[PDB]
Enzyme design. Structure first.
Site, PDB file in Angstrom:
ATOM      1  CE  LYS A   1      -4.884  -6.724  -2.341  1.00  0.00           C
ATOM      2  NZ  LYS A   1      -4.043  -6.077  -1.472  1.00  0.00           N
TER       3      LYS A   1
ATOM      4  CG  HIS B   1      -2.084  -1.038   1.129  1.00  0.00           C
ATOM      5  ND1 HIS B   1      -3.064  -1.336   0.136  1.00  0.00           N
ATOM      6  CD2 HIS B   1      -2.214  -1.900   2.024  1.00  0.00           C
ATOM      7  CE1 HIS B   1      -3.823  -2.261   0.475  1.00  0.00           C
ATOM      8  NE2 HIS B   1      -3.250  -2.935   1.555  1.00  0.00           N
TER       9      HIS B   1
ATOM     10  CG  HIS C   1      -7.513  -4.200   6.293  1.00  0.00           C
ATOM     11  ND1 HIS C   1      -7.633  -5.017   5.252  1.00  0.00           N
ATOM     12  CD2 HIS C   1      -8.529  -3.781   6.952  1.00  0.00           C
ATOM     13  CE1 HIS C   1      -9.002  -4.760   4.962  1.00  0.00           C
ATOM     14  NE2 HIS C   1      -9.511  -3.983   5.966  1.00  0.00           N
ATOM     15  CG  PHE C   2      -6.378   0.493   1.871  1.00  0.00           C
ATOM     16  CD1 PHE C   2      -7.430   0.516   1.333  1.00  0.00           C
ATOM     17  CD2 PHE C   2      -5.458   1.563   2.024  1.00  0.00           C
ATOM     18  CE1 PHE C   2      -8.049   1.992   0.870  1.00  0.00           C
ATOM     19  CE2 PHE C   2      -5.765   2.796   1.710  1.00  0.00           C
ATOM     20  CZ  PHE C   2      -7.112   3.087   1.025  1.00  0.00           C
ATOM     21  CG  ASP C   3     -12.097  -1.420   6.175  1.00  0.00           C
ATOM     22  OD1 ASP C   3     -12.020  -2.713   6.077  1.00  0.00           O
ATOM     23  OD2 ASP C   3     -13.385  -0.921   6.213  1.00  0.00           O
TER      24      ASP C   3
END
Ligand code: C2P
Length: 124
Positions: free
Chosen positions: A41, A12, A119-121
């Site tokens: 992904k 990210h 984590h990227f939400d």
């Protein structure tokens, strides 16, 4: 072995660019960051901000995560992000992405001590 916090950086963080430069950005970054190692992904956001400023989000606006967890935080400000989404012509090992550049608030989950993103939400 890779940490969740190193894994969030790898997948990210791109502090090295202000914004994605061309329609190719996603294709090359997904590949070079090893996100298409075992399969394509299908969604991945890169953030074009300093690591300190994305670590700070962990002390900004606490919000539920999409899945209902409550260790999610939303940036007080918008950030420059690139959204990468798999296209109809994607086909492993030749994974293919649409490059969308945007400026949005970001929502991450945090853990650990130091308390950092892992984590990227969502972007909003
Ligand atoms: N706007 C979004 C939505 C999702 N994800 C990534 O796509 C995944 C599955 O939907 C999310 O879990 C996240 O991965 P990660 O948890 O590894 O940060 C992303 O990067 N950007």
């Amino acid at each position: 072995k890779e940490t969740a916090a190193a894994k969030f950086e790898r997948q990210h963080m791109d502090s090295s660019t202000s914004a994605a430069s061309s329609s190719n950005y996603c294709n090359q970054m997904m590949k070079s960051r090893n996100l298409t190692k075992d399969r394509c992904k299908p969604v991945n956001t890169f953030v074009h901000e300093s690591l300190a400023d994305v670590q700070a989000v962990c002390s900004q606006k606490n919000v539920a995560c999409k899945n209902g967890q409550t260790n999610c935080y939303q940036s007080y400000s918008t950030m420059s992000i690139t959204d990468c989404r798999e296209t109809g012509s994607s086909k492993y090992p030749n994974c293919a992405y649409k490059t969308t550049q945007a400026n949005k608030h970001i929502i991450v989950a945090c853990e650990g001590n130091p308390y950092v993103p892992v984590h990227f939400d969502a972007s909003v």
